[PDB]
Amino acid sequence: DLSNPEYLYTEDDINQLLKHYLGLDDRISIIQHVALNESLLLKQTLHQVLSDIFSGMQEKAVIPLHTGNNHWVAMAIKKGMNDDIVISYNDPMGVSIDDKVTLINCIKELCPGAKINDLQTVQQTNVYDCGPFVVDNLIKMSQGQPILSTEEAKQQAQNIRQSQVNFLSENRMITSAAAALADTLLKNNNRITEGVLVDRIFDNKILSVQEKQQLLNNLLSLTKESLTRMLASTHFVQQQANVLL
């Protein structure tokens, strides 16, 4: 339950937040699934990121790293000045990157020239706030902005959680309202044409003229996923999710 002050962020929660905050720059790679207990996948993941930076197709990567006991840590990897690769890291419990032997071995193998920037800053004050701090760290470290100090962290923990969870709640409700409208418009189809979508909007017996004409307007080869995404950007679907409060 997102309203619970002790809610543990999931992988999807962090992905949704990082996409929301950073996603307008397509040169930032947002990595979803990486865990220290999966060494082969970790090395594959870091190598892909380093190859995308080498080629110039990506400038930076933000990586929510899953450690022991469902703990989350923040790693960012960017092109530095000159020809440097900069690895910035912060564990919200203040534990050194050096404690993470697997990760240090991986990095030494793939990029032994990398500049390691372990901020080593205790931030969390309970067993539940890794998620909020990893998100706030990844956003700031990505742009070479200073992360919250131990004192600011203590002062801001509930505020940064509340701001992030407000988005998560809105995101979930808008997406649920968009997916339900998408289901009524798709009927027995997995995919529809623009023409069939418009037919289905004109024929719909529940929407009103304003909502149907705001819809075609707000809209200015379509799947459940792409139509859901479209409907989620529409003002009147956002209105319905806002009432669901």
Author numbering: 6 to 225, 234 to 258
Copy out sentences from the published article reporting this entry, exactly as the authors wrote them.
We cloned the N-terminal domain of OtDUB from genomic DNA of the O. tsutsugamushi Ikeda isolate and included residues past the putative DUB domain (1–311) to examine a potential accessory domain that could modulate DUB activity. We determined the crystal structure of the apo-enzyme at 2.0 Å resolution, which revealed that the Ulp1-like domain of OtDUB has the predicted core fold of cysteine endopeptidase (CE)-clan proteases. OtDUB lacks an N-terminal VR-1; instead, the C-terminal accessory domain (residues 170–259) protrudes into the VR-1 position via an extended α-helical arm positioned close to the catalytic site, suggesting that it assists in substrate binding. The C-terminal region of the protein fragment, residues 260–311, was apparently disordered and not observed in the structure. When compared to the phylogenetically closest structure, RickCE from Rickettsia bellii, we observed structural conservation of only one VR: the small loop in VR-3. Besides lacking the N-terminal VR-1 present in RickCE, VR-2 of OtDUB comprises a loop and two short α-helices, while RickCE VR-2 is a large helical arm largely absent in OtDUB. These large structural differences between the two DUBs, and other prokaryotic CE-clan structures, are obvious when aligned, yet the core protease fold is conserved (Cα root-mean-square deviation (RMSD) 1.2–3.9 Å). A substantial structural transition of the UBD was supported by the apo-DUB-UBD1–311 crystal structure, which lacked density for residues 224–235 at the beginning of the UBD, a region that includes the ubiquitin-interacting residues D226 and K230.
